[PDB]
């Protein structure tokens, strides 16, 4: 709710979070559209020339704007990544454990950058006993 003489609202740093339009008396809001950087995940150029672009802290909505090829990590939307059920060691860290690691499985349905939750190592169970 705004007072009769209140139409501009500075949030913490003279940034107008909320404004009131002049014609009617609605109370509006301001939020920057698509702030947030990018990233590039690729193997060596000699090894391959296909890259995967990361859009951090961005929900998977702007992918068709700049472009399976869809993934929503805890850090941000990642394109050009093929999820895999199993887990290997971390080759190219991204975030939240998702470590991209390009691998050519059998030259068929491969030669693509894949992203997966990294394994922590080889699981083990020591044959413990009391004697």
């Amino acid at each position: 709710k705004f007072l009769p003489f209140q139409q501009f609202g500075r949030d913490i740093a003279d940034t107008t979070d909320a404004v009131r339009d002049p014609q009617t008396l609605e109370i509006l809001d301001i939020t920057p559209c698509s702030f947030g950087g990018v990233s590039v995940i690729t193997p060596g150029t000699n090894t391959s020339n296909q890259v995967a672009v990361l859009y951090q802290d961005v929900n998977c909505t702007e992918v068709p704007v700049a472009i399976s090829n869809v993934f929503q990590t805890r850090a941000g939307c990642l394109i050009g990544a093929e999820h895999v059920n199993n887990s290997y060691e971390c080759d190219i860290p991204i975030g939240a454990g998702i470590c991209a690691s390009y691998q050519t499985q059998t030259s068929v349905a491969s030669q693509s950058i894949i992203a997966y939750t990294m394994s922590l190592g080889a699981e083990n169970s020591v044959a413990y006993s009391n004697n």
């Binding site: 940034t15 702030f35 850090a75 991204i94 922590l120 699981e123 083990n124 020591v126 006993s129």
Partner: protein, 417 residues
């Protein structure tokens, strides 16, 4: 005069160390210009301080990832706890992770996680992107669980090579050997030792969920980082000399041929604030790196071994250390041997039996006033003086403080034939 303890209180003290500041980055163009093209062009002319800033902060984030990955991931294989837990009466259920919770953590780490609690989107608008740590809380908990399993089953040998299952009492007796106490003490007072350990663990658990000031270092580092970011944001609300503190007003009111001076003032002031901020971040990250190296070393020769260095693995003699996860930090449960229940005694460095001094081969010489006994240094275990506990070192004249007393020969009764 000598004093020897007769009882030991196995304390459990917690040492909390920062391990990593919150990963953070900022965009020069977003912070200084706020998505304005004129300011971006002016700063591109002004120089590559943008690249320097971004590279420095990216290096900070990378080295923090390295700290997190190096202080914890010291195990080649992720061991898991055994199903049946007959750990010599040591109730480990409080620190061993259990599947009852939706998150596979233990209880003490849960209390630590819920102890520390911290708007961000408003600051995030001006390029204050916060990257998430590569290792997640679940994987950190799994690392802690693997370390605890290794310590509880193999002890120290899993640091060197393959883990070797050891009965828990056996490795505890080995640790008493390492701290100069014979195995017999433990193998005679095992039940009392287990009761003391469980009582200490319970008291620690109750103490943790009493006052939130225990995690002082972690709370202070989080608060310092939040305050630094907050004042960095608040710096945007200053004129720095020009008519207005917002770029859009300057652009609208004044043409660039005249507004260039004011926008240059804003650019210089904000970049000065930003470089001050990154210098502070560099120094704080160096401090955190030193703390993380100390934490890694402490884990290396406390959890995976038994350091004979005083106060490195808790006050008093050191037995084990149980690492536990924490929000952007680690905590160690230094299981410390501490003597108590002392008693005055009369001591003599040597005994002259047949003209020859009989030094003790291992232990001290004490007397209850009537008899004469030899005991281990750190525990009152009276023993009859025999030739097995002593060794002759020549004539008994040069030594000072020697007392005339007999030495029982074990062979003589066997010579009854």
């Amino acid at each position: 005069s000598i004093a020897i303890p007769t009882n030991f209180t196995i304390s459990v003290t917690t040492e909390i160390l920062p391990v990593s500041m919150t990963k953070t980055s900022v965009d020069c163009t977003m912070y200084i210009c706020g998505d304005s093209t004129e300011c971006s062009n002016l700063l591109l002319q002004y120089g590559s301080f943008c690249t320097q800033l971004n590279r420095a902060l990216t290096g900070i984030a990378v080295e923090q990832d390295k700290n997190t990955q190096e202080v914890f991931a010291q195990v080649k294989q992720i061991y898991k706890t055994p199903p049946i837990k007959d750990f010599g009466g040591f109730n480990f259920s409080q620190i061993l992770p259990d599947p009852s919770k939706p998150s596979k953590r233990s209880f003490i780490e849960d209390l630590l996680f819920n102890k520390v609690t911290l708007l961000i989107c408003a600051q995030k608008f001006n390029g204050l992107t916060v990257l998430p740590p590569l290792l997640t809380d679940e994987m950190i908990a799994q690392y802690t669980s693997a370390l605890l399993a290794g310590t509880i089953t193999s002890g120290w040998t899993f640091g060197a090579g393959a883990a070797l299952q050891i009965p828990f009492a056996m490795q505890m007796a080995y640790r008493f050997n390492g701290i100069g106490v014979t195995q017999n003490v433990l193998y005679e007072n095992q039940k009392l030792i287990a009761n003391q350990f469980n009582s200490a663990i319970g008291k620690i658990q109750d103490s943790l969920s009493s006052t939130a000031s225990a995690l002082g270092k972690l709370q202070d580092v989080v608060n310092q980082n939040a305050q630094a970011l907050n004042t960095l944001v608040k710096q945007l609300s200053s004129n720095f000399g020009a008519i207005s503190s917002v770029l859009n007003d300057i652009l609208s009111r004044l043409d660039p041929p005249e507004a260039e001076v004011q926008i240059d003032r804003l650019i210089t002031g904000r970049l000065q604030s930003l470089q001050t901020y990154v210098t502070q971040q560099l120094i704080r990250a160096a401090e955190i790196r030193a703390s993380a190296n100390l934490a890694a070393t402490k884990m290396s020769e406390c959890v995976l071994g038994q350091s004979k260095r005083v106060d490195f693995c808790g006050k008093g003699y050191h037995l084990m250390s149980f690492p536990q996860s924490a929000p952007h930090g680690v905590v160690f449960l230094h299981v410390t041997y501490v003597p108590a229940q002392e008693k005055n005694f009369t001591t003599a460095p040597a005994i002259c039996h047949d003209g020859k001094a009989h030094f003790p081969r291992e232990g001290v010489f004490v007397s209850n006033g009537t008899h004469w006994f030899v005991t281990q240094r750190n525990f009152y275990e009276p023993q009859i003086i025999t030739t097995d506990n002593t060794f002759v070192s020549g004539n008994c004249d040069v030594v000072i403080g020697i007392v005339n007393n007999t030495v029982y020969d074990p062979l003589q009764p066997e010579l009854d034939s």
